[PDB]
């Protein structure tokens, strides 16, 4: 698409609409649901808000840290590593979670859930040179 913003400017615009509307607008991407993760900034201490694909199961969520399978980690990856207490907004509702990087069978199961929501995640694997981080968020 020739007449679209950069992916970074799109993410900024989406998170702005999402937050300013109290989760009543801007909550989808290609028809698929998006959440807003709030993390504590590792360096600055500021609260940082990031739109991510919604992957949910019985009140837990998972988030995938991957810029299209590229190896450089998103900055919010570092915020979670430093501070596991995060907030997650799903539409009009928000809550507190403990985020942890998962491994093994747990990671495989959540990855399958994520690929059902956002099939492109499977394609990203073909570009990888580092593990793809997956976090599971449990209510707290
Ligand atoms: C460009 C950078 O963003 P980032 O945290 O590297 O994240 C890159 C992307 O993951 C981010 O744009 C995502 O929202 C993109 N994104 C997804 N990204 C994903 O990785 N996974 C997804 O499933 C996903 C879905 C998605 C859906 C909609 C959408 O609009 C965007 C989506 C950024 O926002 N810069 C900030 C960083 C803010 C920050 O947290 N800084 C820390 C720095 C700490 C340190 O560097 O150690 C601080 O304040 O101290 C800034 O500096 O102003």
Residue numbers in the entry: 5 to 144
Provide passages from the article that reported this PDB entry:
The full-length structure of a second, inactive homolog, nfa18080 from N. farcinica, was solved by X-ray crystallography in the presence of F420 (rmsd to Holo-1 is 1.1 Å over 109 aligned Cα atoms). The protein core, short N-terminal helix, and coenzyme binding site are conserved for nfa18080 relative to nfa33440. Electron density for the N terminus of nfa18080 starts at residue 5 and approaches the active site of a neighboring monomer in the crystal. The side chain of Y7 of one monomer stacks on top of the exposed Re face of F420 of another monomer at the location where one would expect the enzyme substrate to bind. The homolog structures provide insight into possible orientation of some conserved N-terminal residues in relation to the active site. However, because of low sequence homology (about 20% identity to Ddn residues 1–30) and flexibility of the N-terminal helix, these structures do not provide a reliable model for the missing Ddn N terminus.
